[PDB]
Amino acid sequence: GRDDTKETVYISSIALLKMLKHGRAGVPMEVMGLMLGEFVDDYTVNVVDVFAMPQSGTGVSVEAVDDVFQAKMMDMLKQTGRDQMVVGWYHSHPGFGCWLSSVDVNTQKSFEQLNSRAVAVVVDPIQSVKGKVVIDAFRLIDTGALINNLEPRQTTSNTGLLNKANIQALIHGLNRHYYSLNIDYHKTAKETKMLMNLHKEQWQSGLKMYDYEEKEESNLAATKSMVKIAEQYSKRIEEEKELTEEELKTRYVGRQDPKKHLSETADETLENNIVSVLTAGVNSVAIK
Amino acid sequence: NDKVRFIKDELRLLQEPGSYVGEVIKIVSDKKVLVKVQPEGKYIVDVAKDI
Amino acid sequence: DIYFKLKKLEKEYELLTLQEDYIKDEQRHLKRELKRAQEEV
Amino acid sequence: MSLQHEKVTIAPLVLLSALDHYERTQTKENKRCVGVILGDANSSTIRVTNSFALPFEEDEKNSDVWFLDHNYIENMNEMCKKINAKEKLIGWYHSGPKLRASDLKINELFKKYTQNNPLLLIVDVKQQGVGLPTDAYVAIEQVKDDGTSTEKTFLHLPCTIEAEEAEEIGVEHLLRDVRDQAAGGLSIRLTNQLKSLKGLQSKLKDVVEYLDKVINKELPINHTILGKLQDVFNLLPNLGNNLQKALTVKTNDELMVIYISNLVRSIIAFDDLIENKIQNKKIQEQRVKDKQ
Amino acid sequence: KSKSSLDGKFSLFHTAVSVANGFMHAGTTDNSFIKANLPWLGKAQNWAKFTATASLGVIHKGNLLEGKKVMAPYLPGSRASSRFIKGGSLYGLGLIYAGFGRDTTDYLKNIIVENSGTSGDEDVDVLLHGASLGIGLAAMGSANIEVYEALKEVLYNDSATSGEAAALGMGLCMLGTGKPEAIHDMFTYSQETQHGNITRGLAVGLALINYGRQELADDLITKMLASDESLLRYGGAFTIALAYAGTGNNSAVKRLLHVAVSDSNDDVRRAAVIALGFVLLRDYTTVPRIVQLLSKSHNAHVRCGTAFALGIACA
Ligand SMILES: [Zn+2]
């Protein structure tokens, strides 16, 4: 069995959150930790959660593979469940991008000579943004299968070919030493229901009107700004009569366009005002 | 939808390398133009099929 | 004759109603994904 | 002794580790799950950042048969210090659903390992609640509400779930299917208003139910609770007279401001319509004179 | 010419060329290209051989009189080395006797029963996959309960290589009948198996189960289209497609549009749009009007779905 291209690594919420927390805490040191999961089958590599290996005084090299810490953590994690294998290791590459280096290749070789199906997930906390956490597992090419030129990839499905290899990743060599894998975060109803709590305000804050002096100073300032912006709008309309389109396409690049400011001020003050009215009336009626 | 597609495609286009400002000191031929690019030296550039 | 015209017009109306509901829902989700893509970029 | 119990902040990782722990050890009903709440302290706002599992055991019997390993706490401490020396033990959490008998007793076991007063974190791991499933309970000593010996008991603290840069990225990625990223400002504020009103109604119903219980003497008489309720009644303003006139004049001024803003919005729409009509006429002329 | 600029040192290109050759001589009882470029067939590893034998089966479609003996030097018992060629042989044998097959059904049932006992043997699993795919094909609508039981036996082996084919054959065997027991069994089993392939296979089997029963399949649409596993909604789309198949009923179309616009997993979006294309197959004039709005969406999966919808509708 020459593997397949439809192989997908399933990262749980716990694993990804711990990954990001540990990666951001060690910038720019390439911290590394193991990856507790299970091999469901040939096509799926489940990952339950991860724990961090200590970063020895090496600097920006992933070479601290201390065995005492790994053995102790594995043995006395068993006391409270998590009976799983040593499926993979993750190390953060902050700033450069998702790609393996020679040291990373050697470490993954060491892991492969122990499990032969060990992924090499590479977090990147620096260039990750709220919705596009960049994550992609890797696994080394076999060896002399390049004589057959059949790197272990049987495209029995389109699910693996959809992902596109990165540009700079190919520079370090993607399809030359480690065929890429797919990443599929699998959630749970309990977890997604209740992570919503991060954006649930305190109950005793909705009916709290703020001090009734700032709500008048803000209104007066907004009205004065509106007057000035309306005057600027008048002069804008006056000046627009004798301008050619090749300038208007670039006219308001460097100066305040006195139209979007007017609309923004109107909308913001109207929203604030409506909220203030509703809060005042609601408390005046219900609180009494 | 056109706005959304443009915004989605913008991410790839930003990573494409930029372009130097050139200066046409002399026209050489019908397909080669001598251009002095600031601030290092000059080059014999190729005109696109539009210009 | 006339019955066929009535039924064809009814079918056209019903398909158009499908189209209208489709377009409204797609408007809402295009707003959502526009905000998401603006954030992602 | 440090008084640091004003505010509590929890990163989502501690809580999700709690949920993972509960779903991992296959805890059935009545089986509580307990771990440690590693974080940073010595400031006014106690902040919980990381957690781990503990081999807590207890039979549903006499409350003193609770068992917990002592070496495990220090053994986890050493490894976590090796990983990060900025996270120190600040107490413990249990997997809800509500306070139990041994909470005061077991808290003293963590007194030596902790440096400040140990922090209790209730986690509604099975999610019966509607608001935040987390609340803090710092064990402090205060006089009895019944005029009896001073008791060392728990005090509720205002707990707010807040994430840092590292965990906000993951939270935003994970629930990037249900959160309404469009939403709208005024709409979301009004929704928050309605949610707050519903929460007020729920708390009022709970207080009414408790009073109904106390009149039947299923619970004893606490004079502190009754005094707080009477203070709540005293603080209730009477509106339905001078305050009424002041509120009316402020509302009138505020509505006038709203009127002005709506007028400005309408004129902006007018300019947009004029410009759009101009561009449409230009496009029509373009197509007409270029076709011909 | 196609084989020229398509290296056989690629499972993708080898499978492409094999499938194209099978379609070029579909039912023509002529494997001249295969009998000419034998070295090209030599460049087949693992699942590539499966597709080659399947194409050989496609070529001899309708040759019920003498088709078994051509597949005889590929069936179990012969001097075949790779298990992927015996599995492909069974698949092609099921392919050849499509519809008018009763001896093939018995032969494949015997093979399934004999070899289903073994568990974990990587040689047994591929043969089981091929035999199950064949026997499901040789029992389309026959509602052979013995075949269904033999296919349930293999699917319970929990093997990810034979699980998908076992589920698909189980769905094909009970096609259209809508058995109230197979429905419950497969739906319950889909929510337990950790393997991803088996879940989608069971979803597609459930979709095949409800073929034709328009009002009777109103349930399992509220369930699966509101399920949590993103693979089960993919099956709900196809269940809508096959329940209200060629009818144009508006409940199905409205729900399909709602799924195709409001969902996170793009795979289900593609499935929903393909289902939309399948529902309106009797109104092929209208389809390029509903899908015209679909074909300009930002998401590429929806575009592939509407392409497939056009392909299915105006076939
Ligand atoms: Zn590295």
Swiss-Prot record, chain A:
Assigned EC number: 3.4.19.12
Modification after translation: N-acetylated by NAT3.
Keyword tags: Acetylation, Hydrolase, Metal-binding, Metalloprotease, Protease, Proteasome, Thiol protease, Ubl conjugation pathway, Zinc
Chain span(s) of sequence motif JAMM motif: 91-104
GO MF term list: cysteine-type deubiquitinase activity; metal ion binding; metal-dependent deubiquitinase activity; metallopeptidase activity; proteasome binding
EC top class, as a word: hydrolase
Cross-referenced InterPro entries: JAMM/MPN+_dom, JAMM_MPN+_peptidase_M67A, MPN, RPN11_C
PROSITE patterns (alphabetical): MPN
GO biological process: mitochondrial fission; peroxisome fission; proteasome assembly; proteasome storage granule assembly; proteasome-mediated ubiquitin-dependent protein catabolic process; protein deubiquitination
Superkingdom of the source species: Eukaryota
Chemical reaction(s) catalysed: Thiol-dependent hydrolysis of ester, thioester, amide, peptide and isopeptide bonds formed by the C-terminal Gly of ubiquitin (a 76-residue protein attached to proteins as an intracellular targeting signal)
Binding positions (Zn(2+)): H91, H93, D104
MPN domain span: 9-144
Entry-linked SUPFAM superfamilies: JAB1/MPN domain (SSF102712)
One GO cellular component, as annotated: mitochondrion
Family: Belongs to the peptidase M67A family.
UniProt comment concerning the protein's domains: The JAMM motif is required for the deubiquitination and degradation of ubiquitinated substrates.
Role, per record: Component of the lid subcomplex of the 26S proteasome, a multiprotein complex involved in the ATP-dependent degradation of ubiquitinated proteins. RPN11 is the only catalytically active member of the lid and serves as the essential deubiquitinase of the proteasome.
UniProtKB/Swiss-Prot annotation, chain B:
PTM (free text): N-acetylated by NAT1.
Location relative to the cell: Cytoplasm; Nucleus
Note from the entry: Present with 4700 molecules/cell in log phase SD medium.
Family per record: Belongs to the AAA ATPase family.
Subunit structure: May form a homodimer or a heterodimer with a related family member. Interacts with OLA1, TMA17, and UBR1.
Role played: The 26S proteasome is involved in the ATP-dependent degradation of ubiquitinated proteins. The regulatory (or ATPase) complex confers ATP dependency and substrate specificity to the 26S complex.
The protein's name in its UniProt record: 26S proteasome regulatory subunit 8 homolog
Record organism: Saccharomyces cerevisiae (strain ATCC 204508 / S288c)
UniProtKB/Swiss-Prot annotation, chain D:
Residues in MPN domain copies: 8-143
Record note on modification: N-acetylated by NAT1.
Encoding gene (name): RPN8
Function: Acts as a regulatory subunit of the 26S proteasome which is involved in the ATP-dependent degradation of ubiquitinated proteins.
Superkingdom as given in the UniProt entry: Eukaryota
Gene Ontology MF, one: metallopeptidase activity
Lineage per the UniProt record: Eukaryota, Fungi, Dikarya, Ascomycota, Saccharomycotina
Keywords: Acetylation, Phosphoprotein, Proteasome
Pfam family, one: JAB
N-acetylserine, modified sites: S2
Keyword Glycosyltransferase listed: no
Descriptive protein name: 26S proteasome regulatory subunit RPN8
Ubl conjugation recorded as keyword: no
GO cellular component: proteasome complex; proteasome regulatory particle, lid subcomplex; proteasome storage granule
Swiss-Prot record, chain E:
Post-translational modifications reported in the UniProt record: N-acetylated by NAT1.
PC repeats: 51-84, 88-125, 130-164, 165-199, 201-234, 235-270, 271-303
Note: Present with 4750 molecules/cell in log phase SD medium.
Physiological role: Acts as a regulatory subunit of the 26S proteasome which is involved in the ATP-dependent degradation of ubiquitinated proteins.
Complex and partners: Interacts with UBR1.
Protein family membership: Belongs to the proteasome subunit S1 family.
Protein name (record): 26S proteasome regulatory subunit RPN2
Lineage: Eukaryota, Fungi, Dikarya, Ascomycota, Saccharomycotina
